């Protein structure tokens, strides 16, 4: 029967490193992490022509309309015709020696093309990836979400197909081929829920604050610094740490909230009153308790 | 005394029935959450249903 | 890159490396992890609990762990003159990072103690902060073949301002060739120093860059990715500090964040260091105090973190007051199974002995 | 045909069985925009078209 909305004024997330310069090869992928900020999703999507997406325990439209504790993006230059080599359970060199997607958090894999005139991203000369990485053969495979152990060796650069570099203990080999047409990229996105007192929010999901003072003891929808739900609020003596802002019980259900007005509110799920019916068949009449 | 222990056991059986009833609402049964509000917030049809 | 300030010039100060005066039977002051006070426990992120007990899976020290002791000393001094620095051999030791660690700081402050430089002299003990280098690959310092050199980007954490500031930067460390510096033939250890006569003379004019200036004499800082600093309130209370790393970067924790009179550590920073940290080394400090004003410095203790299950008790205000390490013994397992510190008298079946290949 | 995705039915069953009614919506559409028609897409196609 109402809405309870409280949000803090935050800065804008910094995506400029991704939108300027040359994206790296896959084995040297760049990672960005965001917390306690807002970002314009509609603008970002209009800079790219998506060719495929695959998500796990989340959907892109929910990312557009809700908030999360943090947002991690790994990105690199990647030819779209090699898409199958990034699939889970692939047996090829991409997963073994370059990038292996982690599935411990909700995650989505996106491939896209950079339109020729639209952006300030610059093209590399070649696409590139590693074909092997071994200790003298004792192969060394990527951990999920990690970097290849051969990363330092590979930074010497690759000038021809199947050129090798060694340092005495590690050896790695590289493959290169030219970029033709518009540049193509890959993005690996993951989010977390309920690990911070503040949130990351798309700009389209923001709403004006409202008060709870005239809505006590009734069921309302709430959005408190990105944490949403339904519940009934009541003014209470303060318990728990105010600077942690949220109080939970043993089942990890929210039971309290410290407001920026200075008060503490007990929180309960929406309740329903019992009803019983007394019926007499002979007279066909009824009453209620 | 055994009889007093039996009294306390009867009371405890009554309490345990209710506690087991309430605890089952936190079982995910292999879904992404035990809360319907979270499921509606994070997924879309047909995966939602 | 970010500006790291004015490049260093001149010579480094000599250090006398003498471990037999530091790791000695007379300087052993053991302190173990006491779970009944929840020592070394990191508080969960983004929430709190009030007046309940529950189990929690995370990174925790092992119960009754002794850890590892470290002690810093004044440098050599005579009336009117300042001489060589005096240190142990911490600068050449390299430790595995594994899952991270926690540090107990200033536990013996307010007690009378030895001035390591002089086995007879005794002084009241003062708190001193540690300094760290953390990185992904290590080698030898090139001229002397002394171990402990950090290659490529290195994370440095360095206290400063007479205990009112700490730096945190990620840059390549390029050795200098001047006398006693990291690229010279007379180098013995990376030892940072401050001069309290000119640095800590007045609480309104604390030198916030003295330790950083000393570090820059050993190395030229190149291609730094970031430079942060955090302000600290000066006092003599015991403290805890902690560091971990995961997909989202390096996390730093401190008991000063919420209530320094409680020992719970709270998250206060995340650093964008995404390549896995494998090694760390303590950077020794040596205070150039004058001969008339000589001091004793509190030892600090490092305990490793492990992925474990803990039983946590929260009071009404939300602090963690006591804990149980579930895998320590059979009684601890029984308590964790019942999610309670108070169990009834009885005979119980518990988890069987683990059989792994 | 370049792609198909079905929900609770298969094209071969449509070829070999009967049904109460059959509804077809159709339009001109570039095949390289295929992902924008997927369930849970965040783009302008699902929002406004
Ligand atoms: C605590 O941590 C902060 C953050 O790292 C430090 O702040 C930086 O301090 C340095 C000085 O050490 C500042 O550097 C100077 O910036 C001037 C202006 O910079 C503009 O551009 C930068 C980059 O975008 C912006 O960050 C900044 O806000 C400005 O918009 C330059 O003009 C200075 O150059 C001159 O002096 C240097 C001295 O070494 C010479 O080498 C140059 O040739 C030149 O003569 C200089 O670069 C830096 O701007 C500060 N950053 C911020 C965000 O404030 C604190 O110093 C540190 N505090 C401590 C350790 O006590
Ligand atoms: C997220 O990013 C979006 C993309 O940057 C933001 O949208 C843009 O917002 C600006 C500011 O409101 C708009 O600019 C104005 O547009 C109007 C309308 O332009 C059209 O009509 C005029 C004639 O009336 C014509 O001259 C133009 O060519 C257009 O046909 C102009 O009248 C204004 O002068 C001004 O240019 C952008 O149009 C708008 N872009 C899009 C694609 O919508 C969005 O605001 C960001 N969101 C947040 C919350 O920051
Ligand atoms: C070394 O000695 C100093 C001085 O005695 C110690 O600092 C003081 O310690 C006491 C006891 O913890 C602090 O008392 C508390 O103060 C707070 C203030 O709000 C109050 O709420 C508590 O009820 C309690 O009275 C005192 O404030 C503190 N003084 C300072 C300047 O911090 C110090 O802890 C000792 N160090 C060691 C290692 O024993
Ligand atoms: N220089 C110096 N540093 C020290 O840390 C030191 N510590 C002691 C003894 N330290 C301690 C600390 C805590 C407890 C304790 O159990 N509480 C006992 C002894 C004696 N001399 C010293 N001398
Ligand atoms: C740092 O100094 C300590 C103390 O001298 C060294 O440990 C000793 O090493 C010698 C030589 O192998 C052994 O005989 C002693 O038993 C060790 N002492 C103890 C207390 O264990 C340590 O090796 C030095 N670390 C270096 C040089 O990296
Ligand atoms: C770093 O220096 C150490 C010595 O501090 C080197 O270890 C020596 O290795 C040689 C050649 O194998 C042996 O003959 C010596 O006996 C070793 N000395 C000691 C004290 O153990 C080590 O090889 C050097 N490391 C690198 C990476 O060059
Ligand atoms: C990381 O540090 C190492 C050690 O300083 C660098 O290694 C040298 O790199 C050059 C150029 O590739 C080689 O010619 C040398 O043989 C390397 N030395 C050793 C001991 O391997 C390495 O280049 C640095 N990596 C990055 C990414 O800058
Ligand atoms: C520090 O960063 C600079 C800038 O990227 C590096 O200088 C580049 O080095 C490469 C490899 O030698 C050259 O191809 C570029 O022309 C250099 N660029 C500029 C602007 O000088 C430098 O190598 C890095 N320093 C290290 C790793 O010690
Ligand atoms: C094109 C391969 C044809 C191989 C024909 C017969 C192979 C015998 C057994 C092969 C194992 C199956 C590998 C399948 C490769 C899938 C692509 C990938 O995992 O990335
Ligand atoms: C090409 C987009 C790259 C964006 C990089 C990082 C973005 C930060 C968060 C983004 C939310 C995920 C949107 C995924 C778009 C899938 C395509 C679609 O739903 O139709
Ligand atoms: C929300 O607040 C802003 C700032 O006061 C105001 O401009 C805007 O009109 C408000 N929106 C609504 C829908 O009331
Ligand atoms: C809520 O309770 C607190 C503490 O009892 C009280 O100070 C405060 O005024 C109450 N709030 C309102 C809106 O009455
Ligand atoms: C805290 O919990 C104890 C144990 O159940 C209970 O007796 C006590 O009343 C509680 N205290 C408060 C202040 O709610
Ligand atoms: C360091 O080792 C090298 C051999 O690798 C040797 O030539 C050199 O003299 C050594 N330096 C010292 C100071 O022992």
- Phi, psi of C299, rounded to the nearest 5 degrees: -70, 155
Asked whether C147 lines ligand 14 (CB < 6 A), one says no
The residue among C110, C98, C252 whose CA lies nearest residue C167 is C252
Beta strands A227-236 and A264-268, pairing class: antiparallel
- Cα(A5)–Cα(A239) distance, integer angstroms: 22
State in Å: Cα C172 to ligand 8 middle. Answer: 12
Q: What residue in D sits closest to A43 (Cα-Cα)?
A: D43
State in Å: Cα A209 to ligand 11 middle. Answer: 9
**Residue A157: Cβ-neighbour burial (10 angstroms; 0-12, 13-18, 19+):** exposed
Asked whether D13 lines ligand 10 (CB < 6 A), one says no
Structure token digits, residue A130: 């590693």
Of A69, A197, A239, the CB nearest to C50: A239
Non-local (6+) Cβ contacts of D34 within 8 A are D2, D3
DSSP of A115-138: -TTT-EE---SEEEEEEEEEE--E
Do C and B make contact, counting contact as 3+ CB pairs within 8 angstroms? no
Phi-psi group of C286: left, alpha or beta (phi > 0 → left; psi -120 to 50 → alpha; rest → beta): beta
User: Distance, in angstroms, between A263 CA and closest chain D CA?
Assistant: 38
Q: Half-sphere exposure (CA, 13 Å, Cβ side) for C283?
A: 22
User: Distance, in angstroms, between B28 CA and closest chain D CA?
Assistant: 23
C34, C105, C111, C286: residue to mutate for ligand 4 pocket, most atoms within 8 A of CB: C111
DSSP of chain D: ------SSS-HHHHHH---S----------GGGGGGGSTT--SHHHHH-
User: Distance, in angstroms, between D1 CA and closest chain B CA?
Assistant: 24
Non-local (6+) Cβ contacts of B24 within 8 A are none
Interface test with A, best of B25, B28, B36, B37 (most A CBs within 10 A): B37
Dump strand ranges (E) for A10-100: 11-12, 20-21, 30-34, 37-39, 49-56, 70-77
The answer to whether A238 and A75 have CB atoms below 8 angstroms apart is no
Using CB distances shorter than 6 Å, the residues near ligand 2 are A 40, 42-43, 203
> Which atom of ligand 13 lies at the shortest distance from residue C316's CA?
13
Structure token digits, residue C116: 């390591």
The residue among C221, C99, A230 whose CA lies nearest residue B40 is A230
Chains touching C (at least 3 CB pairs under 8 A) are A
Structure token digits, residue B18: 């209710």
Of A57, A228, A251, the CB nearest to B41: A228
The answer to whether A9 and A170 have CB atoms below 8 angstroms apart is no
Beta strands A70-77 and A126-135, pairing class: unpaired
User: Distance, in angstroms, between B42 CA and closest chain D CA?
Assistant: 10
Do A and C make contact, counting contact as 3+ CB pairs within 8 angstroms? yes
Of C52, C249, C318, the CB nearest to A241: C318
Q: Does residue A197 belong to the interface with chain C, where contact is any CB pair within 8 Å?
A: yes
Non-local (6+) Cβ contacts of C238 within 8 A are C104, C105, C106, C107, C109, C127, C263
- Buried b / exposed e over C183-201, threshold 16 CB at 10 Å, is bbeebbbbbbbbbbeebbe
The residue among C241, C243, C264 whose CA lies nearest residue C48 is C264
Q: Which helix (H) or strand (E) holds C230?
A: strand C227-231
Of A58, A62, A229, the CB nearest to B37: A229
The answer to whether the Cβ–Cβ distance between B47 and D39 falls below 8 Å is yes
Structure token digits, residue A162: 């199947």
> Which atom of ligand 1 lies at the shortest distance from residue C5's CA?
39
- Buried b / exposed e over A185-204, threshold 16 CB at 10 Å, is bbbbbbbbbbebbbbbbbee
Q: What is the DSSP letter of C91?
A: G
- Cα(A19)–Cα(A44) distance, integer angstroms: 9
Of all protein residues, whose CA lies closest to atom 1 belonging to ligand 5? C89
Residues of C near A (CB-CB distance < 8 A)? 45-52, 54, 137, 152, 247-249, 258, 270, 272, 274-276, 316-319, 339
The answer to whether the Cβ–Cβ distance between D40 and A62 falls below 8 Å is yes
Q: Which residues pair with C239 in a beta bridge?
A: C105
User: Distance, in angstroms, between B10 CA and closest chain A CA?
Assistant: 26
Ligand nearest to the CA of A83: 9
- Cα(C233)–Cα(C257) distance, integer angstroms: 11
Non-local (6+) Cβ contacts of C241 within 8 A are C102, C103, C105, C130, C252, C253, C254, C255, C265
The answer to whether C13 and C85 have CB atoms below 8 angstroms apart is yes
Q: What residue in D sits closest to A51 (Cα-Cα)?
A: D35
The residue among A101, A93, A42 whose CA lies nearest residue A75 is A101
What angle is formed at CA A22 by the lines to CA A16 and CA A26, rounded to 5 degrees?
Answer: 105
The answer to whether A31 and A72 have CB atoms below 8 angstroms apart is yes
Of C50, C137, C152, the CB nearest to A240: C50
């Amino acid at each position: 029967r109402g809405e309870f909305i409280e949000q803090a004024t935050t800065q804008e997330c910094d995506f400029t490193p991704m939108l300027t310069g040359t994206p790296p090869p896959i084995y040297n992928f760049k990672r960005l992490v965001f917390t306690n900020c807002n970002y314009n999703l509609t603008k970002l999507l209009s800079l790219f022509q998506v060719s495929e997406f695959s998500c796990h325990q989340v959907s892109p439209s929910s990312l557009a309309t809700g908030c999360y504790s943090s947002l991690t993006v790994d990105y690199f230059a990647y030819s779209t015709d090699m898409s199958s080599y990034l699939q889970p359970g692939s047996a090829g060199e991409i997963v073994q020696f370059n990038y292996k997607q982690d599935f411990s958090n909700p995650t989505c894999r996106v491939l896209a093309t950079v339109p020729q005139n639209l952006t300030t991203i610059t093209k590399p000369s070649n696409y590139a990836y590693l074909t092997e990485c071994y200790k003298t053969k004792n192969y060394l495979y990527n951990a999920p979400g990690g970097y290849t152990p051969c990363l330092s060796l590979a930074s010497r650069g690759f000038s021809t197909k199947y050129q090798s570099h060694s340092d005495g203990e590690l050896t790695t080999t590289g493959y290169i081929y030219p970029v033709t047409g518009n540049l193509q990229m890959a993005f690996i996105i993951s989010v977390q829920y309920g690990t911070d007192t503040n949130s990351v929010c798309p700009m389209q999901a923001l709403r004006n604050d409202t008060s709870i003072e005239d809505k006590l003891d009734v069921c309302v929808e709430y959005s408190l610094h990105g944490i949403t739900g339904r519940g009934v609020f009541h003014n209470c003596t303060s318990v728990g740490l105010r600077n942690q802002r949220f109080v939970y019980d043993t089942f990890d259900n929210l039971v309290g909230y410290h407001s920026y007005n200075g008060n503490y509110y007990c929180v309960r799920p929406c309740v329903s009153v019992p009803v019983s019916v007394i019926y007499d068949k002979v007279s066909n009449s009824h009453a209620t308790l | 005394n055994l009889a007093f222990n039996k009294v306390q056991d009867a009371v405890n059986a009554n309490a345990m029935a209710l506690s087991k009833l309430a605890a089952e609402l936190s079982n995910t049964f292999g879904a992404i959450s035990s809360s319907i509000s979270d499921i509606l917030a994070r997924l879309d049809p047909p995966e939602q249903e | 890159s970010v500006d790291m300030g004015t490049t260093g010039s001149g010579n480094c100060i000599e250090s006398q490396v003498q471990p037999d005066f530091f790791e000695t039977a007379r300087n052993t002051w053991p302190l173990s992890i006491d779970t009944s006070k929840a020592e070394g426990v990191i508080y969960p992120n983004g929430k709190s609990y009030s007046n309940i007990t529950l189990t929690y899976t995370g990174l925790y020290p092992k119960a009754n762990d002794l850890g590892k002791q470290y002690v810093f000393s004044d440098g050599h001094s005579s009336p009117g003159t300042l001489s060589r620095l005096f240190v142990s051999n911490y600068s050449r030791q390299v430790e595995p990072f594994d899952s991270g660690f926690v540090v107990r700081i200033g536990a013996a402050a307010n007690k009378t103690g030895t001035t390591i430089i002089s086995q007879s002299t005794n002084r009241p003990i003062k708190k001193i902060y540690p300094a760290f280098m953390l990185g992904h690959s290590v080698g030898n310092y090139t001229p002397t073949n002394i171990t402990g050199r950090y290659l490529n980007h290195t994370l440095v954490i360095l206290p400063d301002g007479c205990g009112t500031l700490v730096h945190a930067f990620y840059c390549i460390l390029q050795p200098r060739t001047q006398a006693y510096c990291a690229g010279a033939s007379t180098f013995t250890s990376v030892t940072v120093w401050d001069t309290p006569a000119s640095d800590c003379a007045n609480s309104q004019s604390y030198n916030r860059l003295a330790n950083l200036n000393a570090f820059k004499l050993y190395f030229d800082l190149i291609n730094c990715t970031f430079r942060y600093n955090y302000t600290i309130t000066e006092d003599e209370n015991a403290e805890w500090f902690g560091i971990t790393q995961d997909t989202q970067g390096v996390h730093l924790y401190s008991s000063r964040k919420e209530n320094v009179f409680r020992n719970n550590m709270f998250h206060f920073a995340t650093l964008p260091v995404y390549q896995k940290i494998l090694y760390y080394t303590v950077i020794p400090r040596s205070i150039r105090s004058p001969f008339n004003d000589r001091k004793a410095w509190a030892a600090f203790y490092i305990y490793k973190l492990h992925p474990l299950t803990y039983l946590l008790n929260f009071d009404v205000e939300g602090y963690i007051t006591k804990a149980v390490d579930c895998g320590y013994d059979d009684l601890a397992q029984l308590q964790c199974s019942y999610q309670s510190f108070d169990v009834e008298t009885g005979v119980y079946s518990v988890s069987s002995f683990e059989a792994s290949p």
